[PDB]
């Protein structure tokens, strides 16, 4: 019954703007595609988005795809054809293909442009052109992590296999891996696998490690010693000039502009490590055969070959301060044109294999990823600047981000809300979703709801502003560029496209929009439902469901009773309607015959510290009185459990662990009006 929703975040952007992109989706449900109607009736195990499409996975094992643009989508639901009894268990997203995984551990390919996924006559069992390349044919995989240009699969043999998209196959066997059992993961079993456009992270029971390119600062610091070492002689000596550019014209490289991978070569020498150059961008037809100029920032650009063949020449004649060195390209005229005469002080002796080498950032065996202590790992994801995670030590949850080039949590944050509310009903529901390409991060909750995130002036998690959304089933997202974008405009180059599934809650939503008629009409039907059958399921899921911020049915019925306008409250001596049904629903809920027995555990709870306490703190005083009256009534008849009168009643007014500043009496006196409401813009003498 999950409703699928779309949202677009124009990158580059801030954490704030995402919330406004997650607010109108809540507004739309509180206000009021045809091809996707049949998709809602079945649960979606996983959802991914490619360059111009979006893939879906169903509970039984079927896979489907859809195309969209910027969102407007066509009406074509091309199911994956499975004539044989083939069921799928995992799905990945690639810029070129919709690679899939069947019930058995062999992986398929459904390249976006092509209609039929994969047919091979000579090898009918083969469904991936590299399936025999990584040697996964005789084993089975249970993990899969696919990103814009990357993919990694792992077998029960603790064997991990990596490869890139076919648009980057020109420099395969450097990024990619043939697939063998490491000495990293041999100790603990693999529990999950994550990948991004630059590197892949594997999480173990008490360990995390990664392998791949490590650009940026770690890549940056390679040259301070390397340039110093290079800058710091007889006939027949292999000597080279002490000065040496970082990259000569001819190094191959690749980069991502707006989600479009482009492999390039440079036609000039890299002198400074912060300049930008116009690279050579080759047509895709000639990419696999193994000049335009578009400016490329050297920071993002990664050079994907190793220059171990730096020109070193053999000395043929030493004449005073000058040395005749013939670097790679007896008549004196022919020799002089090729052989170069250089000063002895500018030349340093070179051994065999001692020539300078480009960054060895292509990591195969990692270190510097340490969990603080024996702490359980909730969820882990990978972004453009680190590996996000949410850890836990007893009753202390946190949001630490490991900088892969450092070995320690770069910064530490504590959730402003109570950690016990983050755990929720099911602990494992917590998840962190990142697209990867400097994209924003959204993290889920214990109840499956979205926990809004933003920073404050001191650098910490700002106190959340609840978006009022139901729990989310699937939260796949990805980045795709703006096609047909005129170069003369200021509109952004790329955007992040996020999928959603709000999973629907009948009465939870019927109170969020203060519609009295639906709320009551639901109740006797429930009242007639709980009778004439003596047992069913919807009775006990009444308490189970939870809105944003660990708020139950009673909390939401209070969140709509908050005063909003000072009008009629001046007392100098349809918002107005919407508040009226808010009290009407609240009165109905308390006196309902069927729910009655469950108000004992309903009037005790959210993410900060009880429905009655939220009323006095939210300035809903008539709502607090009605809740207080019901609390007395419930406690009076409770005595049958052989417990005192005061403890049952006190659980619905001020629980034992409530902090001193959250008392209903103290909060009642604290609530006032700010000085601005009687002063104005002028200055007065006040504390």
């Amino acid at each position: 019954m999950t409703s699928i929703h779309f949202v677009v975040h124009p990158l580059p952007g801030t954490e704030d703007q995402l919330n406004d992109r997650l607010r109108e989706v809540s507004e739309k449900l509180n206000k009021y595609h045809p091809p996707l109607n049949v998709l809602e009736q079945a649960t979606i195990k996983q959802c991914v988005v490619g360059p111009n499409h979006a893939a879906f996975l169903l509970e039984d094992g079927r896979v489907c795809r859809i195309g969209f643009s910027v969102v407007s989508l066509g009406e074509d639901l091309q199911w994956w054809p499975d004539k044989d009894g083939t069921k799928f268990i995992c799905i990945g997203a690639l810029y070129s293909e919709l690679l899939a995984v069947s019930s058995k551990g062999e992986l398929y390919q459904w390249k976006w442009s092509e209609s039929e996924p994969y047919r091979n006559a000579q090898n009918p069992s083969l469904h991936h052109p590299r399936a025999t390349f990584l040697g996964l044919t005789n084993e089975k995989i249970v993990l899969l992590s696919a990103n814009s240009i990357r993919a990694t699969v792992a077998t029960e043999n603790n064997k991990v296999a990596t490869w890139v998209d076919e648009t980057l196959s020109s420099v395969a066997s450097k990024l990619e891996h043939t697939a063998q059992t490491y000495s990293e993961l041999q100790g603990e079993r693999i529990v999950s696998l994550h990948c991004c456009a630059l590197y892949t992270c594997a999480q173990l029971e008490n360990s995390l490690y990664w392998w791949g390119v490590v650009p940026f600062s770690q890549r940056k610091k390679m040259l301070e010693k390397a340039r110093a070492k290079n800058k710091k002689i007889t006939v027949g000596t292999q000597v080279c000039l002490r000065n040496n550019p970082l990259y000569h014209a001819g190094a191959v490289a690749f980069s991502i502009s707006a989600g479009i991978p482009k492999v390039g070569v440079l036609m000039e020498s890299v002198w400074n490590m912060n300049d930008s150059c116009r690279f050579q961008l080759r047509s895709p037809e000639s990419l696999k055969n193994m000049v335009n100029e578009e400016q490329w920032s050297l920071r993002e650009v990664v050079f994907v070959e190793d220059v171990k063949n730096v020109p070193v020449g053999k000395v043929l004649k030493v004449d005073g301060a000058y040395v005749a060195v013939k670097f790679p390209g007896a008549d004196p005229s022919s020799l002089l044109q090729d052989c170069r005469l250089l000063r002895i002080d500018e030349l340093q002796v070179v051994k065999t294999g001692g020539t300078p080498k480009v960054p060895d950032c292509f990591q195969r065996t990692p270190k510097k990823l340490c969990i603080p202590e024996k702490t359980e790992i909730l969820a882990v994801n990978v972004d453009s600047k680190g590996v996000h995670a949410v850890l836990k030590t007893g009753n202390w949850v946190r949001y630490c981000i490991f900088d892969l080039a450092t070995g320690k949590a770069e910064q530490e944050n504590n959730f402003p809300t109570s950690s016990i509310a983050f755990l929720g009903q099911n602990e494992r529901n917590v998840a962190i979703f990142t697209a990867g390409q400097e994209s924003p991060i959204i993290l889920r909750d214990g109840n499956g709801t979205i926990y809004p995130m933003a920073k404050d002036c001191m650098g910490g998690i700002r106190d959340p502003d609840w978006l009022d959304l139901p729990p989310i089933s699937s939260l796949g997202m990805g980045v795709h560029s703006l096609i047909n974008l005129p170069a003369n405009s200021t509109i952004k180059k790329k955007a992040a496209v996020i999928i959603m599934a709000v999973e629907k809650q009948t009465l939870m939503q019927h109170i969020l929009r203060c519609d009295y008629e639906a709320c009551r009409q639901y109740l006797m039907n429930l009242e007639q439902a709980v009778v004439l059958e003596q047992n069913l399921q919807m009775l006990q899921t009444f308490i189970s469901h939870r809105c944003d911020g660990n708020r139950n049915i009673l909390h939401a019925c209070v969140s709509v009773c908050f005063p909003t306008s000072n009008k009629e409250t001046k007392e100098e001596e349809e918002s107005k309607d919407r508040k009226a049904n808010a009290h009407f629903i609240l009165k109905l809920l308390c006196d309902s015959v069927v729910l009655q027995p469950y108000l004992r555990e309903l009037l005790s709870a959210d993410a900060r510290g009880t429905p009655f306490m939220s009323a006095v703190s939210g300035r809903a005083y008539p709502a607090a009185i009605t809740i207080l009256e019901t609390a007395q009534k419930i406690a009076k008849a409770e005595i049958s459990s052989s417990e005192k009168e005061e403890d049952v009643f006190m659980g619905m007014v001020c629980p034992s662990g409530t902090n001193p500043d959250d008392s209903p009496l103290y909060v009642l006196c604290c609530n006032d009006t700010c000085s601005f409401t009687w002063t104005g813009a002028e200055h007065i003498n006040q504390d």
Side-chain angles (χ1 to χ4, degrees):
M1 46 302 308
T2 65
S3 168
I4 272 179
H5 268 50
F6 277 92
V7 63
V8 188
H9 178 216
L11 267 159
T14 35
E15 306 147 333
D16 229 2
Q17 295 157 290
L18 219 174
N19 303 349
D20 319 56
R21 290 306 100 70
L22 294 179
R23 189 70 44 98
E24 77 284 33
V25 308
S26 66
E27 205 71 2
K28 176 155 325 311
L29 281 308
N30 283 271
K31 179 64 61 48
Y32 70 100
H33 260 64
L36 253 49
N37 306 156
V38 299
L39 181 50
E40 327 217 317
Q41 311 320 87
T43 88
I44 286 87
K45 167 68 64 47
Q46 194 172 316
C47 177
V48 292
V49 281
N52 302 50
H53 283 0
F56 287 109
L57 177 65
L58 263 53
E59 63 241 49
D60 27 282
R62 293 183 293 148
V63 175
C64 167
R65 79 183 188 188
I66 200 43
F68 74 99
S69 325
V70 71
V71 293
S72 50
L73 64 149
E75 184 167 299
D76 296 293
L77 229 41
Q78 310 88 332
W79 289 90
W80 187 300
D82 41 356
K83 303 167 193 65
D84 43 352
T86 44
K87 296 321 290 146
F88 300 115
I89 89 160
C90 190
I91 282 282
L94 240 312
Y95 182 81
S96 325
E97 69 273 2
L98 203 182
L99 83 164
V101 155
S102 170
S103 328
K104 279 331 312 163
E106 78 294 338
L107 77 167
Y108 304 4
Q109 283 216 330
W110 192 11
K111 277 79 65 202
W112 296 114
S113 46
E114 298 83 317
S115 188
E116 175 297 352
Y118 208 103
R119 270 180 218 290
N120 196 1
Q122 58 95 4
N123 199 310
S125 56
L126 192 88
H127 303 280
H128 186 151
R130 336 286 194 76
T132 32
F133 283 41
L134 305 314
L136 307 142
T137 53
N138 61 289
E139 314 83 333
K140 58 91 186 170
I141 47 56
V142 313
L143 295 326
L144 165 63
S145 321
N147 214 58
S148 58
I149 55 91
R150 195 130 167 182
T152 310
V153 293
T155 69
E156 79 285 5
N157 313 352
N158 315 292
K159 184 132 51 59
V160 311
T162 311
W163 72 101
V164 314
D165 54 347
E166 94 313 348
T167 324
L168 275 274
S169 104
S170 73
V171 72
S173 319
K174 282 308 295 171
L175 282 318
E176 88 96 17
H177 221 191
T178 166
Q180 54 299 15
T181 79
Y182 267 82
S183 57
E184 313 167 32
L185 329 176
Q186 93 294 13
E188 304 159 6
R189 303 321 71 192
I190 281 167
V191 302
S192 150
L193 200 67
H194 302 296
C195 90
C196 109
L198 262 288
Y199 52 119
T200 292
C201 167
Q203 56 163 126
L204 284 207
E205 70 81 13
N206 205 336
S207 296
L208 325 190
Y209 273 130
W210 93 107
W211 53 80
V213 194
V214 53
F216 228 88
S217 100
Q218 177 68 289
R219 202 142 72 111
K220 193 39 68 195
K221 88 197 53 160
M222 71 64 165
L223 84 88
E224 294 79 298
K225 59 265 193 174
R227 197 263 319 145
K229 278 179 277 175
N230 280 120
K231 285 205 166 169
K232 279 161 208 150
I233 297 155
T234 64
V235 175
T237 322
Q238 301 189 30
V239 202
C240 87
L241 164 42
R242 295 174 183 200
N243 190 10
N244 222 317
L246 286 288
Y247 306 99
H248 95 301
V252 297
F254 63 98
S255 173
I256 325 289
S257 51
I260 305 160
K262 321 188 290 330
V263 197
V265 74
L266 81 177
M267 56 318 293
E268 68 96 46
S269 195
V270 166
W271 271 141
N272 154 276
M273 76 314 314
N274 318 307
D275 295 340
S276 324
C277 343
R278 312 180 298 150
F279 266 68
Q280 168 299 107
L281 288 90
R282 152 158 21 77
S283 300
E285 279 80 9
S286 179
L287 184 269
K288 292 127 73 173
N289 284 1
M290 338 173 261
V291 156
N292 51 58
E293 301 280 289
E294 293 190 1
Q295 188 87 306
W296 269 26
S297 145
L298 202 264
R299 172 68 298 155
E300 188 304 340
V301 176
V302 76
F303 299 107
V304 73
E305 56 64 16
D306 199 337
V307 181
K308 309 194 174 203
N309 299 355
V310 175
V312 178
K314 189 170 185 176
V315 176
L316 309 180
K317 196 169 182 180
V318 202
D319 182 22
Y322 274 116
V323 183
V325 193
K326 189 183 170 183
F327 291 97
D331 172 67
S333 75
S334 68
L335 265 50
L336 283 159
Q337 270 190 21
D338 295 347
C339 196
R340 313 175 177 184
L341 199 73
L342 314 170
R343 316 192 144 204
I344 182 165
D345 306 315
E346 307 161 328
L347 288 157
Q348 170 174 343
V349 188
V350 190
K351 304 181 187 178
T352 53
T355 71
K357 312 190 171 187
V358 302
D360 305 292
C361 299
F362 289 63
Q363 172 63 283
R364 283 57 136 131
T365 37
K367 46 166 198 173
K368 318 290 290 311
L369 251 176
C370 80
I371 284 317
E373 199 248 5
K374 177 121 189 171
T375 69
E376 179 297 355
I377 289 274
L378 276 309
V380 164
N381 218 311
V382 191
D383 208 54
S384 66
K385 61 55 163 183
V387 167
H388 308 293
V390 34
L391 322 185
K392 166 248 180 49
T393 297
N395 171 8
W396 179 81
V397 195
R398 41 201 198 304
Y399 182 81
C400 90
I401 298 172
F402 294 131
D403 217 352
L404 78 172
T406 65
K408 59 101 143 168
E410 155 163 293
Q411 78 299 31
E412 196 41 359
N413 293 349
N414 295 314
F415 292 113
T417 68
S418 311
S419 72
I420 178 59
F422 196 71
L423 302 197
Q425 309 161 251
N426 204 346
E427 181 170 357
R428 92 177 38 73
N429 254 309
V430 289
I432 301 165
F433 304 81
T434 98
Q437 321 326 350
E438 41 71 15
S439 312
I441 290 56
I442 64 192
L443 88 171
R444 211 157 53 177
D445 208 338
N447 314 310
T449 36
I450 289 154
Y451 187 100
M453 273 225 174
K455 315 303 297 313
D456 67 75
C457 294
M458 200 126 63
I461 304 304
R462 187 191 301 172
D463 36 3
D465 219 336
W466 306 123
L467 331 103
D468 213 357
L469 279 161
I472 263 49
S473 194
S474 97
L475 204 30
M477 79 174 162
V479 47
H480 104 89
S481 54
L482 291 289
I483 318 299
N484 204 338
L485 180 272
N488 316 294
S489 71
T490 71
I491 314 156
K492 276 71 71 197
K493 302 318 324 323
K494 74 182 85 168
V497 169
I498 320 176
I499 210 82
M500 253 182 275
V502 285
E503 157 267 311
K504 200 274 318 304
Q505 265 145 16
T506 38
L507 197 40
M508 182 79 287
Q509 186 298 356
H510 271 343
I511 57 186
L512 284 178
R513 43 149 67 115
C514 314
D515 168 33
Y516 176 41
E517 280 322 352
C519 209
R520 43 89 56 61
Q521 174 31 18
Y522 181 93
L523 277 167
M524 58 309 312
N525 314 1
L526 203 293
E527 162 58 59
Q528 312 278 30
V530 291
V531 304
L532 318 179
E533 98 307 355
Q534 194 52 238
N535 41 3
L536 232 121
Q537 297 87 67
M538 63 298 210
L539 181 272
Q540 324 102 0
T541 187
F542 209 40
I543 267 46
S544 87
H545 67 191
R546 222 75 59 95
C547 185
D548 213 350
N550 199 19
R551 291 186 305 186
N552 57 42
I553 314 179
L554 254 294
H555 285 61
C557 205
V558 174
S559 74
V560 286
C561 302
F562 289 179
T564 46
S565 175
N566 287 298
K567 193 302 307 305
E568 288 148 0
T569 97
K570 312 94 48 259
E571 308 166 298
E572 301 305 300
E573 306 169 59
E574 233 286 352
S575 72
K576 164 170 62 51
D577 194 13
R578 250 265 299 290
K579 301 322 194 328
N581 326 62
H583 291 118
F584 281 17
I585 295 158
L586 182 65
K587 194 68 60 47
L588 154 70
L589 253 56
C590 269
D591 90 4
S592 173
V593 199
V594 44
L595 166 66
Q596 195 266 356
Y598 291 107
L599 295 151
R600 165 71 195 285
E601 67 175 1
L602 224 38
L603 289 163
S604 192
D606 45 14
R608 57 81 137 151
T610 303
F612 163 70
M613 295 178 24
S614 177
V616 312
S617 184
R619 224 147 289 183
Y621 299 131
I625 304 167
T626 54
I627 296 168
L628 192 56
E629 295 174 54
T630 304
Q632 304 221 86
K633 187 67 31 54
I634 272 285
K636 255 169 55 33
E638 194 313 318
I639 314 172
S640 63
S641 76
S642 99
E643 300 307 316
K644 315 182 313 310
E645 270 284 345
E646 67 66 8
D647 74 341
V648 152
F649 178 78
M650 226 65 232
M652 321 144 171
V653 171
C654 174
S656 34
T658 281
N659 92 347
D661 282 2
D662 277 346
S663 302
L665 207 66
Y666 172 59
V667 167
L668 188 72
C669 288
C670 265
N671 302 340
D672 255 29
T673 41
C674 156
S675 304
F676 203 75
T677 62
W678 61 271
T679 62
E682 48 83 29
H683 298 51
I684 60 152
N685 44 300
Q686 66 188 306
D687 69 343

